[PDB]
Design an enzyme around this catalytic site. Sequence first.
Site, PDB file in Angstrom:
ATOM      1  CB  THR A  40      -0.920  -0.016   1.247  1.00 48.11           C
ATOM      2  OG1 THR A  40      -1.842  -1.080   1.092  1.00 48.11           O
ATOM      3  CG2 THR A  40      -1.739   1.283   1.371  1.00 48.11           C
ATOM      4  CE  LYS A  49      -5.084  -0.380  -0.887  1.00 50.67           C
ATOM      5  NZ  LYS A  49      -3.628  -0.593  -1.266  1.00 50.67           N
ATOM      6  N   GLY A  82      -7.129   8.172   4.733  1.00 47.61           N
ATOM      7  CA  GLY A  82      -6.580   7.077   3.961  1.00 47.61           C
ATOM      8  C   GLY A  82      -5.984   6.046   4.882  1.00 47.61           C
ATOM      9  CB  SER A  93       4.676  -1.681   1.640  1.00 47.69           C
ATOM     10  OG  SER A  93       3.562  -1.605   0.765  1.00 47.69           O
TER      11      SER A  93
END
Lengths: 174, 174, 174, 174, 174, 174, 174, 174, 174, 174, 174
Positions: free
Chosen positions: G1, G34, G45, G125
Amino acid sequence: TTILSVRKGDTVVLLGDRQVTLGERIVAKSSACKLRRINDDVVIGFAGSTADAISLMEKLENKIGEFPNQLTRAAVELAKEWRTDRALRRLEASLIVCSAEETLEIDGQGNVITPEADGIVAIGSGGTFAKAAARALIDVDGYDAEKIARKAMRIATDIDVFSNEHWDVEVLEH
Amino acid sequence: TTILSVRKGDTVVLLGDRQVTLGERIVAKSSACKLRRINDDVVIGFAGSTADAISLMEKLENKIGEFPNQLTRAAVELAKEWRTDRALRRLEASLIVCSAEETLEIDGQGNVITPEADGIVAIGSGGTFAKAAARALIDVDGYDAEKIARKAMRIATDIDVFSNEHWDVEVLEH
Amino acid sequence: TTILSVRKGDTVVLLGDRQVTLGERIVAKSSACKLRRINDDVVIGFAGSTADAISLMEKLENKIGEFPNQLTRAAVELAKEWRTDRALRRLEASLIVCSAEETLEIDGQGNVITPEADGIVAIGSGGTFAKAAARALIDVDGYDAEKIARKAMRIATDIDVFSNEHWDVEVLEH
Amino acid sequence: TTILSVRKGDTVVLLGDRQVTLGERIVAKSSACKLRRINDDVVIGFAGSTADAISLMEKLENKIGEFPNQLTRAAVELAKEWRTDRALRRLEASLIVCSAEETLEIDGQGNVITPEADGIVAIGSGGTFAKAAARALIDVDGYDAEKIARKAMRIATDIDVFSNEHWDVEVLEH
Amino acid sequence: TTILSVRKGDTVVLLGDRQVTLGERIVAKSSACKLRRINDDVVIGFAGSTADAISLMEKLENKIGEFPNQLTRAAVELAKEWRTDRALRRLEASLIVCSAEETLEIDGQGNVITPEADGIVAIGSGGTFAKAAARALIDVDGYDAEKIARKAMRIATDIDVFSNEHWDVEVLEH
Amino acid sequence: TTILSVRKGDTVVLLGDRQVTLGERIVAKSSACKLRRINDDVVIGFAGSTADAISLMEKLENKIGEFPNQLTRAAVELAKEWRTDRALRRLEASLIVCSAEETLEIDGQGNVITPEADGIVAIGSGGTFAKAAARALIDVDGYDAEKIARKAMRIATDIDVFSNEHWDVEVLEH
Amino acid sequence: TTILSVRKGDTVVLLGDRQVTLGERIVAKSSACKLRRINDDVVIGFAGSTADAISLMEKLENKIGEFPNQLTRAAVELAKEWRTDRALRRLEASLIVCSAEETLEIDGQGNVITPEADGIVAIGSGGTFAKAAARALIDVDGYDAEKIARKAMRIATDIDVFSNEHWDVEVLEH
Amino acid sequence: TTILSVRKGDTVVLLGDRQVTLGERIVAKSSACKLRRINDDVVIGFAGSTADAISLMEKLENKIGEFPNQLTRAAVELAKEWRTDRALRRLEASLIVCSAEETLEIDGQGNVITPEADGIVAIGSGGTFAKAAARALIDVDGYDAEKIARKAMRIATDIDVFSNEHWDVEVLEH
Amino acid sequence: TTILSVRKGDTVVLLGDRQVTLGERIVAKSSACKLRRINDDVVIGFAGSTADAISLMEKLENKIGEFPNQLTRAAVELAKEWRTDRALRRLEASLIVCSAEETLEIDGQGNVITPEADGIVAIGSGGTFAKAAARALIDVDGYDAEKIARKAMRIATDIDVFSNEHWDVEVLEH
Amino acid sequence: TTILSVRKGDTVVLLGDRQVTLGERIVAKSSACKLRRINDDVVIGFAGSTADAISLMEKLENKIGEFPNQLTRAAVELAKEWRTDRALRRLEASLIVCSAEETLEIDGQGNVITPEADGIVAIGSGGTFAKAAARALIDVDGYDAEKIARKAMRIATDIDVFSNEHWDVEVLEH
Amino acid sequence: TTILSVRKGDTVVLLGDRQVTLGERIVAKSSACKLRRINDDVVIGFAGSTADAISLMEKLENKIGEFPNQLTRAAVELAKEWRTDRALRRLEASLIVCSAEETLEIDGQGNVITPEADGIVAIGSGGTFAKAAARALIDVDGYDAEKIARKAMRIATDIDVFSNEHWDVEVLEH
Ligand SMILES: [Mg+2]
Ligand SMILES: [Mg+2]
Ligand SMILES: [Mg+2]
Ligand SMILES: [Mg+2]
Ligand SMILES: [Mg+2]
Ligand SMILES: [Mg+2]
Ligand SMILES: [Mg+2]
Ligand SMILES: [Mg+2]
Ligand SMILES: [Mg+2]
Ligand SMILES: [Mg+2]
Ligand SMILES: [Mg+2]
């Protein structure tokens, strides 16, 4: 496995069970012989796999041939070689070696163990149970070596899931 | 993998499944042969990878050629070499070797196992299921070796997720 | 990585993605070629690092030169050498090797896998997804080898975070 | 560590930070040079210890001398040797090698990575940050290679606790 | 386990295999049903144990009753409760829920996943293979939802050692 | 432990061994009963410790009382409670529950397993061996349920080091 | 993500990718949103699962309602509750919350991070790659917030195997 | 262990503590000397066991003899040999080498560290504390190299449970 | 610890050693009593810490008071409570409870073990040795319960490094 | 983190760096304040996350309000609560609390540490380095508390990769 | 830590060192008191943190109050509560409690240890060294309790890196 040796008077006996176990779970064979006669005067019993134990028995025979009557010195030389040689250290086994005069236990940690005055040595997952039972009978008059060993094996192998009730027996005198 | 051998009367059969599994998760091949004829008198079945098993088969053939009729001695010499040689110890495999006379199982732990009187030997993740099923039928009159083995394989391979329903068969007589 | 080979009719194709990933986290290159032409008749695809794969390809060439048309034998000999040589065993890779006649997959566990009758072989983190998709199309008339492979790669590389959408293609006939 | 190379137009630059960290905790030196000039045409930067990196640089020089103009081939031969030689595999390092024509990254996993069309390669705990920042600037007006690399290093080394704000710079043209 | 749902046109199908595996090694049952009809409009398929899955199906019914037509909201409320309730978090399962309009997948990590435009959702150890194969067929002539699903299951379950060849099917329309 | 149930015709039998093992090493008792009669119509066998198994048997009685004839439902309710209650999840055991009509196996993972058409269910370290042997005999002439079960126990308990040769038997009819 | 927020001038943007990954290996969805609008002035988010993130969003809304204009205090109160409540601590997620005035990042370790003067915050990430790329562009005149954010996302998501190329965008002004 | 070197003006000092610890628990000796004079111009201090350190000192002497005045080159050659030689890599030690001109620190990771302009180098479990304290005093009036070093050792060794209060001192000038 | 109970004829004895060991290394006390008289008819011996064992003895007294003559039922109720209560499960102990009629062993795994016909029960690190020795003597002439027990303790405690040579004895008749 | 307190003469200072690090790898913020004024007479500094530290500060304020002038007793009561409360024990933080009279350090292990006669207390990954440097200067006339603390922070934070060069300062007198 | 009590004649002394160590590496305080006077007749010494030990001392005082003269019973009740209460079990500490009449040691494993006839009890990493040294002197005429304890502390704390040379002393008579 249970290997047990009892010396009393002028007799020594060596007994071993016959169970081979895989994965610490299943009996793959219930009739395996774990004793070997290496000559007329010397018998040996093993815990560990066929190949591991036989490889070590062959090195022991080299030593026994290189030190003709000195069984103890042969055992010690074997244990030294075993601990310092890279290939042999990858083997897992324990041995008991008997003559009429001497009994030695040799393991992969490099211990060389002779019995106390009671004459009893044992190895394997069941060995300590066998030794305890044999020690209880060693001094009871009218129980000779073989009778002590059989009784001790019945008791040890009934307790140890990794040993069975079928036993090979070797005897020696002088 | 399931490799099963059953000897009854003058017939011995050797059966193997055909599944290859990767990562203990996926079937990569469903038609792999796990048996090899090494000569007219000797067949062999393997658990383990193609390369690992073939490398050990070739060393076995060296031993078989060095000890012409003594299949048991060849197996033992193989197992000894397997356990003490650095390269071979990095291999993972189990073997069953059959002649009309003798059946031996050899594994990476250095066990060399011959059957009990019932003539049954087995290896692989499914081998023990196969052995239990074969043992149930061994003494039922009118079930010959091949019929026992087929029934045992169906049962063992249905249970073992790592073996399939397609089997190769070898037969020997004398 | 996704490497996929599909044989249908007189055509075989070999496809590979182009993503190189470090630490199982980051794309270090998106345009790496994972296929090699080793001669006019033989192509090879690899999962693993450049150096690992190329070292193994070179050994495979030795074996291909030593067993000219027997691509299956060369692959098995490679796998044997790979599993028994200390330096090669420290390498991590998988290969697919194609000729017009034969396709083999070889991995570090020593498996040598030929396809089922559907002609499909695959390796890498995405290989199984590709294989599943190719198998769905293999028997649908009007989908030739290259069309099957492209579709299967799009599907497999969309799912596998370790493979990308850019592909190299090799084709062979006879 | 952060080592970063940017090629734009006829200029390539190679930049490295100067922090040496022990135990992943403490700065033992803040002024260590991580770039080396190996000849007039070739510079190299390293992540890893002085001794590890210098041992690999010396092997790379052997290869460069053995493949005079073919810097890519030299890198690949180095990586092969690195992955198959027992002593070199006990080293931990990553390298970036630059000439005016070519840039390669080589790591201990055996990857040999050339840049995408944007001309950017980077290594070390900070390398990926540097790369992301340099990619943001590569195509923007006013920014030559050196200006991109300085800005990217400031940003990367601010984020990476294992890299500092002091940088060495090498430049090449053709 | 392999649970697969395919929506194409006005049909949605849900398929599940029937294998129950213990210890990741043995098939304990080959005829277990993994689909449930919860009302006339809603079917659900599960990976995980009977008790775990049924406990979560019951909580899903509570949520479906509390949010009558809003299947997506029910799934989300379930996933919230599942992740925050101490007892439910000790359960391991995944679910696919279908109506004629909507398909959702819900897992123990708290993901709630609806399909892409291709209408495909899958779970279990075999699910991703099934999805890959269903995606290869979703847009091809001659293949309705059920035909796609059956083909994809055969392929997925052949590959997954943890799924078998026996499938249950549910169908819905609107 | 080996617990085995075989239903054939109008008879169902339930058998268990009598070995209790500590530390996965030693037999602490060779005459323990692992079967309980919970009423005239229902018997249960257990693997696990006395206290763990009895605690779960008591909960199973609650559920049996709460769902009088629906032994399947009781087992499922038990398994749900077992998996969601904090105290019960710290227990380790498996159960087989029989009536004349129904047999169920319940484990700590929350599986509830009914037999295939062959009528055979089994648990414990030796259970799968017993099942394989029983399946071999289930369809053979001359073998009723009790004869199948005895033979399968002898075979399974000879192989499992954690089960012994002494068995308790319960029988039911309708 | 990858979730990224960039404030420059009177504009703040919030962007998130749409990839959902399972087992750190496979894309299960490529079109997941998201970002959430929680009112006209506030967007949020998330990295983490749907259920985990929504549960924390709901607790954030409680706090936002309990501290009407003080977004920073709400975030801190949320983080305090998150760290001290047993159920919430079993959740894994990170959040970015934006108003026109304020941006906060909140993680499971209990950090509450506001941006530096450059107005940039990121999580997931891929977040740190995005931040590095945004920081390279933040001060380049003619790049507004949205242009910076899109360019940074392209870069970050090309590098992060766990993020994809499809992004949602929210914008706020005052 | 705490080994500390301070160079200020034309004086360099090298100090070490005298504690030897076993098992990270017990002081086996409180009077061990950790400094060696290797010739009139060169002193060295060590962390690590007597045998490990002396073996590496001897190899350093080889290098110092092979590169007569170039202490830095000798230290680098040592570190290269240390990192690549199998036997030397099984040693654990760190060294500080001083001449009047040069101080180098060499560790088992292959770092060769020279001081910053402050002239301070340190190793051992206590070394970093000593360095911090020495850095606080380096530029203060009334403190020469030896006075700095003593004060820094009192502070460092009070904190480090693995160093004691008894110190050996070497001094050099030019 | 070694606790041993031997019932022969109308006498039952209970013996325990007196060694308390910490960290599995050091004797902290050599004169600790491990037997308790709970009433005129009931004695108990323990392995485990004073507090753990006394907390369980107290619960056992609750049960004994709640099931006046049914020692076996009390033991079972204790074991149930022990396994299901959160606080009691954090305790580590094993107990042997004797009356003139009944002997039970209870452990933390929830086993409740009564002796075989030989009347022997034992617990602790030495217990199995003691049992083996007592079983060797149980059926021999001249040996009453106390004589057996003493001899078995000498043997067991000589072997077990965690048990000493000082024993407490309790005797019961009816 | 580095938090450092120095008391000399009638002045006590408290300093803290401003770096927040994630994953022990990346700086997520370089301008975080780690000190708080809790009233006119009391300041506090923290290592740990915002939420963790603030939760503990709030409990400390409860205690400070319950024990008005007795700072030491408040700290101890805090530490007791912190170690015995389930929620608080899941927090990770360390605190330094200063008044003009008293300085205490409290950590998650339940230590409550007051300074030696030198007046110095410190926490965080850099704390010990700061302490060593402050101790070197504490007795040097003309260095007041703030001058000692600043110098010690520059040194500690240069060494600790987890602390930065930007510091907040609080001062107290009486 | 070293806490040591010696009773000889009508005097009992209790001594403790003053070192507090963090991370098993660094002395955070060298002047910490580890003894408490709880009333005129009773002193206690602790290994463990301030908070852990004080929490347990407070529970001990509850017990001492509930069992006025029976120190042993209070200790035992404390140890029972300590082992069965969830919060107290998360504490790590050991205690020695002295009156003129009685000395008890209580640890987190639930041991309650009174001395042998020699009157010596000790705890902490250094406690067993202290005990050994005190046992060598206990019977040497002219060495009273305090002289024995001081000598034993000098010896034990010189050996234990986790104890220092500064000691607190309490004395009691009757
Ligand atoms: Mg046995
Ligand atoms: Mg199968
Ligand atoms: Mg991908
Ligand atoms: Mg930095
Ligand atoms: Mg399958
Ligand atoms: Mg058995
Ligand atoms: Mg991506
Ligand atoms: Mg010290
Ligand atoms: Mg003893
Ligand atoms: Mg720093
Ligand atoms: Mg000390």
